[PDB]
Amino acid sequence: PSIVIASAARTAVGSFNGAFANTPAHELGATVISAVLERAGVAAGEVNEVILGQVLPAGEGQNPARQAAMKAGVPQEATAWGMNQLCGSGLRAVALGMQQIATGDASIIVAGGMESMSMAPHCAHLRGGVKMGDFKMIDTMIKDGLTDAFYGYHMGTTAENVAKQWQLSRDEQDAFAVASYNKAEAAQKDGRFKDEIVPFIVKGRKGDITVDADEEIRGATLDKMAKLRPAFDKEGTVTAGNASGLNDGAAAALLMSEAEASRRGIQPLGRIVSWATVGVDPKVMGTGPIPASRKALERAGWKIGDLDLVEANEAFAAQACAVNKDLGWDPSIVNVNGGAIAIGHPIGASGARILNTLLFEMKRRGARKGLATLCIGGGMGVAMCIESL
Amino acid sequence: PSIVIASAARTAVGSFNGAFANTPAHELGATVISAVLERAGVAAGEVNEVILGQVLPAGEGQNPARQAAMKAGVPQEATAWGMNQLCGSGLRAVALGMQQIATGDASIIVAGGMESMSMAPHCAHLRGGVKMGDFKMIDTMIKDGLTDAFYGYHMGTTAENVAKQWQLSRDEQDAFAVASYNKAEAAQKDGRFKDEIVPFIVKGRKGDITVDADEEIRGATLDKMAKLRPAFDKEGTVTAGNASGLNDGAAAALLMSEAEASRRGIQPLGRIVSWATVGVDPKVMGTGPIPASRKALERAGWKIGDLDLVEANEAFAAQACAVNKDLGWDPSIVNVNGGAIAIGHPIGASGARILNTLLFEMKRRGARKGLATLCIGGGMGVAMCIESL
Amino acid sequence: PSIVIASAARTAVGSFNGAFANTPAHELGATVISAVLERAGVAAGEVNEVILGQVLPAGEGQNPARQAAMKAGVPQEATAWGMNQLCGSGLRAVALGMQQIATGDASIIVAGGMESMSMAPHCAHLRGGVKMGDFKMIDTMIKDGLTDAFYGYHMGTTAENVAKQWQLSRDEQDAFAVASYNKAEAAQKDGRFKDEIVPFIVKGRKGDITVDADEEIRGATLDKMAKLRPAFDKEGTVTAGNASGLNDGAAAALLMSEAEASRRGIQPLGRIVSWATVGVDPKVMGTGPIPASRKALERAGWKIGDLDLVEANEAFAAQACAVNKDLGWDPSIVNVNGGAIAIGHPIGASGARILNTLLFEMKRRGARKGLATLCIGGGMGVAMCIESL
Amino acid sequence: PSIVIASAARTAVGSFNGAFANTPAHELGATVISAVLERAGVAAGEVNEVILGQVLPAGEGQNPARQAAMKAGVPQEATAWGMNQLCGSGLRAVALGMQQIATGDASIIVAGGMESMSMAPHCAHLRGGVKMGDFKMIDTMIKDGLTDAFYGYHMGTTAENVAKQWQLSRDEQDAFAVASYNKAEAAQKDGRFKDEIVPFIVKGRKGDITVDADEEIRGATLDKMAKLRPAFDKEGTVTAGNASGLNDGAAAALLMSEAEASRRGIQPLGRIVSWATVGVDPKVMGTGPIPASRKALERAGWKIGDLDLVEANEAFAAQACAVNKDLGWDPSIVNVNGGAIAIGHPIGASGARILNTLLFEMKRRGARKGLATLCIGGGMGVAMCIESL
Ligand SMILES: CC(C)(COP(=O)(O)OP(=O)(O)OC[C@H]1O[C@@H](n2cnc3c(N)ncnc32)[C@H](O)[C@@H]1OP(=O)(O)O)[C@@H](O)C(=O)NCCC(=O)NCCS
Ligand SMILES: CC(C)(COP(=O)(O)OP(=O)(O)OC[C@H]1O[C@@H](n2cnc3c(N)ncnc32)[C@H](O)[C@@H]1OP(=O)(O)O)[C@@H](O)C(=O)NCCC(=O)NCCS
Ligand SMILES: CC(C)(COP(=O)(O)OP(=O)(O)OC[C@H]1O[C@@H](n2cnc3c(N)ncnc32)[C@H](O)[C@@H]1OP(=O)(O)O)[C@@H](O)C(=O)NCCC(=O)NCCS
Ligand SMILES: CC(C)(COP(=O)(O)OP(=O)(O)OC[C@H]1O[C@@H](n2cnc3c(N)ncnc32)[C@H](O)[C@@H]1OP(=O)(O)O)[C@@H](O)C(=O)NCCC(=O)NCCS
Ligand SMILES: [Cl-]
Ligand SMILES: [Cl-]
Ligand SMILES: [Cl-]
Ligand SMILES: [Cl-]
Ligand SMILES: [Cl-]
Ligand SMILES: [Cl-]
Ligand SMILES: [N+]
Ligand SMILES: [N+]
Ligand SMILES: [N+]
Ligand SMILES: [N+]
């Protein structure tokens, strides 16, 4: 059997404490589920399962994936579950949903990711009780999302390790970040994000607000970016400018077999050809996409030169430069409409966000072979190959 | 391809704020991964992926599944991710790992679940700030694990709905709970839990303690059970005695193809024949196993009368009576060594705990066809069919 | 013995979460201590004791009164302590300092109050530990400052009881509030607050800001006041417009004997003639100033007609109207420069704030006999009689 | 005018998280107020004001002194306020009440202190909001009670400075502590504490408990004292044995003029002859009683040799040895029934606790001249001279 992506959608990527500062992740995920259903011409009553990746679900309630599926209109007879592979959760959920149809355990799968880093709470274990002295309230976003569990420092410190081993100057990282900002603003002004973005209605107290544009896409200049101070190492190279930010958003895609889409008269966005996930040293988790993309290309029977478009998530300017320089693919086909440095980085949703960007750009310019990949905290990477029609 | 379970292991189920009151969940899972590897004669360097279900990972760090795999000795090249389908997470992870080998994306999978409900913290969203007035610190165990997101009451109130619609008296629920307590002591005194339980060393400051026995198994009398007060509805029927408790523990299983085990000279515990997951109304989530077991039996081509052993998770005495009475299978083969009312109910790990109990129960008495099933919060159920040899 | 007030000073009354949103109370009090010393021509080495009233000292450290005296320059040989009689703390500290010199145990006393309601934290008793369930983080400002400990409702509900017993319509309360708002702008625009206000420099990270004007004086119109919703009772009459707000500030006064000021050639602002404090029913604590002012006038040998100026703190429009009609003094001499409804109500500092306003306004228009009074939560009141020169 | 102490009472000193682990301070104070009235034969309607020292009132509600007076039976017409001079609050309140009657502003005063260090909560300022990162929950007991606001270290570090400047060996501090432990047990077993202790009924959920004995008095030997670890400096001399602990309790005294007691036929416990308070360097606040006692004795016209009994609060073994060696008074009359090292140290109540012990021990052995004194954090001391009647 062969599994195709019939439709795809994503919300606008909101800034930290921005438009989605008080919107739970399951409400964002409910909109993308309803969107991919209307775009594919498939009713909610036909969905078998909903697989949504999410990294920071504390305080949101019992299984936010079920909450997003029910709110979207999926009937109670269907099932839904959440998964956590950190930054690759959004893309892995699509591969997992593809495996559901491959084994014959499902027919129609809605897979993607959702993350609301603004809604992440502060926690502390208090069952034993603090009889004396002070104690710390731990930020779940920093602890459970952005801190390496083995070495104790932020993910930005891992990018510093990649910067030293690959010898990437501060100017090369800033130049890469300004290039990502300019491609993202050019794509937004030309309306190349309108096809993938579904508008989200933020029910506020003083009237409702329609969010349909990524609010992190600003105008970056090389001089103001070079004046920023390093955010992690006191004498490092990774700053707030050349590193992705904290963001909210959701993205998903509707999966079915190629024979199913042909029977329904659906023109799919692409066929999932292969996928792969490999682990690396946690010290340099940014190098994850390098062996993961090679394994996916090997499973598909493709060479690196056969790729027409590439979406590599830009967690940091340092890790992105190293991935492009090791794999050696043409950078003019990698992130043609910008990356996470300018658009945003919702952890659980980034895997499906770049897949949304990849799918519509392949259809818009007639590409035949595409690949999406991300780096994962703890030393992992994930990649997937898509073929047109 | 055909997938077999080469080995299985589980830790002792600890009581709430008991032996594992300060032990993180990933430390429990690390012991089960090492156990299933040593029991099967498979080195850690051969593991491709580790899939562990977990419901309450807040405050534990980046991807506790990766932390458990690394501490067990699995090399960095392998991958690991967590999943959350509430109480069915432990069993669903085994089906997902089974799908990894079926699609050809892996060869050896360690799948299971881990949960430390004692380590669940209290949280509160504090980024926006509380300008005036009091606010609530939310227990993540109650909110994200035991409270229905749609109707707002505890999972025990759902058992009250099942008790009312099925008209299950308080005496019938207490008699079912006392029967489960007595079966657990008979199995424990006869040492029928020694094969599945792997001893866990709690490294303390005042010497190390060896935990190798389920700490929830006590002695229950019918009169002491009748004196208990209802724990959820002020005039209900579900009490602390006839309901499962809050517990810590972990369980896992080593997966490989049937041809792989034959090449390695391994005699597997059983072959995974089929599996299924179906959704129901959240009001009566305890009825989850009823359509899930029929769909799993239908996928395997089995009738209910063909089953030799059955492990049905006893979330509540009311919901367990309803599942046995609708499916109508012989209760003398269901939970032969007791259930969660006496052993414990670690949410993310119960799915693999009853699978461990089922597998070793099939090997000791030569059963041929078995089935394990659980109910899931939010209105879902999961089931799996296992065949000996 | 005869005690005189040689000098007095106060900071500008800041709004809740306003200019002093992050300024500790002892830093505000330290500037007022330096001011009353410099204005009276008395060195810091001559201060015997510092008495500062404060209601919300949680989280500020050991004895904030000692911190304010030390930072102001008072030597270590002198002593300092805090007291708490709620809203009357600022005025009671002046009477207590007067008693220190009267009994001969001191010669020079700096007495007043300081309060930073913006810096009040949220607290919770956690030594025993919360084994299960949610718990409340208690706002110390609401609990320890604004909630009646006997009946459990806010101080605004007490104003509702006083309004009902005196039959004060909502329009009569709104008209009284607009009268104080209009008087406050007349005094501020004419610079009648510059003599009492000492400028405070808010040392920030992005430059320093000089605060020298009450930021709560905004100006109320009769129509906009009538459109506001009741803030306490769902069908009441006390709203945010006709009720005082939450504020930060500090105020103090330098005390010495009449012979000492004559010996140093110092001209005091006024002589303390008498003082009194009486308790009332907590349900109607707003009626506190009625018996307290009569008891003070009785001790001084004065009639109500002998008073030239009166400063009665306007905690609420309802409680203030009842005091004016019961005592029956000329309203044209009561709060001639506005009240707490327009200026603000820092609880621990209000007692010295109205004393500061009274002293300088008596000098501005040549008044001879004045009286200041406040109402106290829990059912108390305090009053003091002052004679110029 | 001459002021006498007509009656006095105190509760048993409870251990940290002990018998009074859940008893608010105002409930402890309410029993002491009812006791001093019942012991003197004075109705509650004759009390003019209640002055109670308290250091940790966070979370207890509006003016805990008013709460204690109301529950004790004092009518609403009387007033009540709290004061805070740290460890000298209990004794300073007695001196303040003496000044109320001396100036003629009151006739009957109930003065003392109350403290419940077990009920002190953890707090944190959260109005501005924590937008990113971890934050600390501050222990109000350590921050607002036991940490010097100027140098940042615990009060125990201050005792190390006094021990070093006076060169007090570790053996001399332990020998002084065991001497107080042995003197305290002789008083308790001989029933010399029964007259001052008033029984307190702890109404609990599992039955009521009668507390009528200081639970901190344990058996101390020289060997076990030498085996303890230093509690502050990693290589210091102050340990948990030779330092006072955290405790709960309350104490008060009934004040009136000497002519008033003669008119009511009351036999007073003693006459307040003089009092004094002096400040010292915060690094060595334990030396506070040295200049404070000299200032009190000179005001009373007494020589050190004229004293018959002395109660010097033993905050630490180091600070007590320095005070006894500097003043040079006979140690056989100093703390004849033990000190705070064995009985306990409730901060707000210790000033009245040693006053209670001093008054009854002077009446028990016919002493003529006595003195009580304490050291205060931040560098202060307080002393009072008492003459028996
Ligand atoms: C990098 C990071 C620490 C930034 O934290 P931050 O400093 O609080 O973010 P800020 O928005 O406040 O940036 C601070 C400063 O940089 C400036 N700045 C930010 N982006 C800029 C840009 N693109 N161009 C120019 N200036 C910029 C801001 O204006 C601000 O200056 P100011 O405070 O004086 O106004 C945070 O975004 C982060 O942790 N990123 C990592 C995400 C991650 O790990 N993802 C997973 C990877 S696998
Ligand atoms: C039991 C529960 C309801 C909370 O009640 P609880 O008070 O914490 O239960 P506890 O054991 O701590 O104390 C309960 C009382 O019942 C008694 N009790 C418990 N089990 C008993 C038994 N088997 N026989 C006799 N008495 C028993 C306890 O000793 C205690 O008596 P006590 O008041 O004298 O100490 C909690 O375990 C729960 O929420 N369970 C449901 C979670 C769930 O739904 N899991 C599945 C998810 S689908
Ligand atoms: C603090 C208090 C102002 C709370 O009100 P709040 O709504 O939470 O805070 P705000 O004042 O900012 O909101 C007031 C609203 O009325 C408006 N308002 C306030 N004063 C106004 C005035 N004088 N004229 C016209 N409109 C006014 C405000 O702009 C605001 O409108 P908004 O909804 O658009 O923001 C007040 O109700 C209170 O509780 N005071 C207690 C003080 C006290 O008890 N002291 C002890 C006395 S013994
Ligand atoms: C000294 C202090 C740090 C103790 O902290 P602590 O760790 O809770 O001390 P604990 O009593 O709980 O435990 C001390 C140990 O020594 C033992 N011990 C204590 N006192 C002892 C004694 N007098 N004789 C023999 N053994 C003793 C205890 O049993 C305990 O045994 P453990 O090792 O099994 O725990 C604390 O009480 C303190 O800060 N005191 C100073 C308060 C203060 O400032 N007072 C002056 C105000 S100006
Ligand atoms: Cl800018
Ligand atoms: Cl001058
Ligand atoms: Cl003097
Ligand atoms: Cl000035
Ligand atoms: Cl009088
Ligand atoms: Cl008694
Ligand atoms: N950025
Ligand atoms: N139970
Ligand atoms: N106001
Ligand atoms: N002690």
mmCIF file of N, CA, C and O in Angstrom, chain A residues 23-56:
data_model
loop_
_atom_site.group_PDB
_atom_site.id
_atom_site.type_symbol
_atom_site.label_atom_id
_atom_site.label_comp_id
_atom_site.label_asym_id
_atom_site.label_seq_id
_atom_site.Cartn_x
_atom_site.Cartn_y
_atom_site.Cartn_z
ATOM 1 N N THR A 23 -4.540 31.195 24.480
ATOM 2 C CA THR A 23 -5.278 30.188 23.733
ATOM 3 C C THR A 23 -4.669 28.821 23.986
ATOM 4 O O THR A 23 -3.477 28.625 23.699
ATOM 5 N N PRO A 24 -5.423 27.862 24.521
ATOM 6 C CA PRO A 24 -4.872 26.519 24.728
ATOM 7 C C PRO A 24 -4.512 25.857 23.407
ATOM 8 O O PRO A 24 -5.044 26.186 22.345
ATOM 9 N N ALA A 25 -3.587 24.898 23.489
ATOM 10 C CA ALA A 25 -3.094 24.238 22.286
ATOM 11 C C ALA A 25 -4.180 23.421 21.598
ATOM 12 O O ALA A 25 -4.198 23.336 20.365
ATOM 13 N N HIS A 26 -5.089 22.814 22.368
ATOM 14 C CA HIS A 26 -6.107 21.965 21.759
ATOM 15 C C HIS A 26 -7.116 22.776 20.957
ATOM 16 O O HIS A 26 -7.721 22.252 20.014
ATOM 17 N N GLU A 27 -7.312 24.050 21.307
ATOM 18 C CA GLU A 27 -8.176 24.903 20.498
ATOM 19 C C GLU A 27 -7.512 25.254 19.172
ATOM 20 O O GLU A 27 -8.186 25.343 18.139
ATOM 21 N N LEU A 28 -6.192 25.459 19.184
ATOM 22 C CA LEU A 28 -5.464 25.659 17.935
ATOM 23 C C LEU A 28 -5.477 24.397 17.083
ATOM 24 O O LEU A 28 -5.665 24.468 15.863
ATOM 25 N N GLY A 29 -5.281 23.234 17.709
ATOM 26 C CA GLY A 29 -5.293 21.989 16.963
ATOM 27 C C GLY A 29 -6.657 21.641 16.405
ATOM 28 O O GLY A 29 -6.756 20.977 15.372
ATOM 29 N N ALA A 30 -7.723 22.070 17.081
ATOM 30 C CA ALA A 30 -9.068 21.800 16.583
ATOM 31 C C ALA A 30 -9.328 22.512 15.263
ATOM 32 O O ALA A 30 -10.052 21.987 14.408
ATOM 33 N N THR A 31 -8.750 23.702 15.076
ATOM 34 C CA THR A 31 -8.974 24.453 13.843
ATOM 35 C C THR A 31 -8.262 23.815 12.653
ATOM 36 O O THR A 31 -8.808 23.785 11.544
ATOM 37 N N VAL A 32 -7.053 23.284 12.861
ATOM 38 C CA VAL A 32 -6.340 22.672 11.743
ATOM 39 C C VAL A 32 -6.976 21.341 11.364
ATOM 40 O O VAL A 32 -6.931 20.936 10.196
ATOM 41 N N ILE A 33 -7.564 20.633 12.331
ATOM 42 C CA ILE A 33 -8.266 19.394 12.014
ATOM 43 C C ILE A 33 -9.492 19.687 11.159
ATOM 44 O O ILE A 33 -9.738 19.021 10.146
ATOM 45 N N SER A 34 -10.279 20.693 11.552
ATOM 46 C CA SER A 34 -11.426 21.095 10.746
ATOM 47 C C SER A 34 -11.004 21.606 9.374
ATOM 48 O O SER A 34 -11.741 21.439 8.396
ATOM 49 N N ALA A 35 -9.823 22.222 9.280
ATOM 50 C CA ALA A 35 -9.383 22.797 8.013
ATOM 51 C C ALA A 35 -8.999 21.711 7.015
ATOM 52 O O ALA A 35 -9.443 21.731 5.861
ATOM 53 N N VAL A 36 -8.172 20.752 7.441
ATOM 54 C CA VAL A 36 -7.735 19.688 6.544
ATOM 55 C C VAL A 36 -8.903 18.814 6.110
ATOM 56 O O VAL A 36 -8.834 18.167 5.059
ATOM 57 N N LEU A 37 -9.982 18.783 6.895
ATOM 58 C CA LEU A 37 -11.169 18.032 6.500
ATOM 59 C C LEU A 37 -11.922 18.746 5.384
ATOM 60 O O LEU A 37 -12.331 18.122 4.398
ATOM 61 N N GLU A 38 -12.115 20.058 5.525
ATOM 62 C CA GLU A 38 -12.819 20.816 4.497
ATOM 63 C C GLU A 38 -12.000 20.920 3.218
ATOM 64 O O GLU A 38 -12.567 20.918 2.119
ATOM 65 N N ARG A 39 -10.674 21.008 3.336
ATOM 66 C CA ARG A 39 -9.828 21.136 2.154
ATOM 67 C C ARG A 39 -9.778 19.843 1.348
ATOM 68 O O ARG A 39 -9.608 19.886 0.125
ATOM 69 N N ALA A 40 -9.918 18.695 2.006
ATOM 70 C CA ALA A 40 -9.891 17.410 1.321
ATOM 71 C C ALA A 40 -11.272 16.924 0.902
ATOM 72 O O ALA A 40 -11.367 15.930 0.176
ATOM 73 N N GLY A 41 -12.336 17.595 1.335
ATOM 74 C CA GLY A 41 -13.677 17.126 1.047
ATOM 75 C C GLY A 41 -14.050 15.872 1.802
ATOM 76 O O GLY A 41 -14.819 15.051 1.292
ATOM 77 N N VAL A 42 -13.520 15.701 3.010
ATOM 78 C CA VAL A 42 -13.765 14.528 3.839
ATOM 79 C C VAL A 42 -14.448 14.981 5.121
ATOM 80 O O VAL A 42 -13.958 15.888 5.804
ATOM 81 N N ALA A 43 -15.577 14.354 5.441
ATOM 82 C CA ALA A 43 -16.307 14.687 6.654
ATOM 83 C C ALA A 43 -15.561 14.194 7.891
ATOM 84 O O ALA A 43 -14.710 13.302 7.828
ATOM 85 N N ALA A 44 -15.891 14.799 9.036
ATOM 86 C CA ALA A 44 -15.250 14.413 10.288
ATOM 87 C C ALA A 44 -15.647 13.005 10.716
ATOM 88 O O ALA A 44 -14.874 12.328 11.403
ATOM 89 N N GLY A 45 -16.836 12.550 10.325
ATOM 90 C CA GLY A 45 -17.292 11.216 10.676
ATOM 91 C C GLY A 45 -16.524 10.090 10.015
ATOM 92 O O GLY A 45 -16.740 8.926 10.371
ATOM 93 N N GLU A 46 -15.642 10.402 9.064
ATOM 94 C CA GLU A 46 -14.843 9.397 8.381
ATOM 95 C C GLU A 46 -13.453 9.227 8.982
ATOM 96 O O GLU A 46 -12.749 8.279 8.616
ATOM 97 N N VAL A 47 -13.046 10.115 9.888
ATOM 98 C CA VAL A 47 -11.724 10.031 10.500
ATOM 99 C C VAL A 47 -11.671 8.846 11.455
ATOM 100 O O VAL A 47 -12.552 8.674 12.307
ATOM 101 N N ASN A 48 -10.635 8.019 11.311
ATOM 102 C CA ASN A 48 -10.435 6.884 12.206
ATOM 103 C C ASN A 48 -9.661 7.264 13.462
ATOM 104 O O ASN A 48 -10.034 6.849 14.565
ATOM 105 N N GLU A 49 -8.595 8.051 13.325
ATOM 106 C CA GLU A 49 -7.749 8.385 14.461
ATOM 107 C C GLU A 49 -7.094 9.740 14.228
ATOM 108 O O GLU A 49 -6.882 10.156 13.086
ATOM 109 N N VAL A 50 -6.777 10.422 15.326
ATOM 110 C CA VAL A 50 -6.094 11.711 15.299
ATOM 111 C C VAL A 50 -4.837 11.599 16.150
ATOM 112 O O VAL A 50 -4.916 11.290 17.346
ATOM 113 N N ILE A 51 -3.683 11.851 15.539
ATOM 114 C CA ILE A 51 -2.389 11.745 16.204
ATOM 115 C C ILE A 51 -1.754 13.128 16.191
ATOM 116 O O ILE A 51 -1.373 13.632 15.126
ATOM 117 N N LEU A 52 -1.634 13.742 17.365
ATOM 118 C CA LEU A 52 -1.087 15.085 17.495
ATOM 119 C C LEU A 52 0.099 15.065 18.448
ATOM 120 O O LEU A 52 -0.018 14.595 19.584
ATOM 121 N N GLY A 53 1.238 15.575 17.981
ATOM 122 C CA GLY A 53 2.404 15.697 18.840
ATOM 123 C C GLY A 53 2.337 16.957 19.689
ATOM 124 O O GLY A 53 1.963 18.032 19.221
ATOM 125 N N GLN A 54 2.708 16.811 20.958
ATOM 126 C CA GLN A 54 2.684 17.922 21.898
ATOM 127 C C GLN A 54 3.703 17.651 22.994
ATOM 128 O O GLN A 54 3.784 16.534 23.511
ATOM 129 N N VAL A 55 4.478 18.677 23.343
ATOM 130 C CA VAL A 55 5.599 18.510 24.262
ATOM 131 C C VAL A 55 5.253 19.052 25.644
ATOM 132 O O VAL A 55 5.704 18.513 26.661
ATOM 133 N N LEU A 56 4.446 20.112 25.697
ATOM 134 C CA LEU A 56 4.114 20.796 26.946
ATOM 135 C C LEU A 56 2.608 20.786 27.165
ATOM 136 O O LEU A 56 1.926 21.798 26.983
#
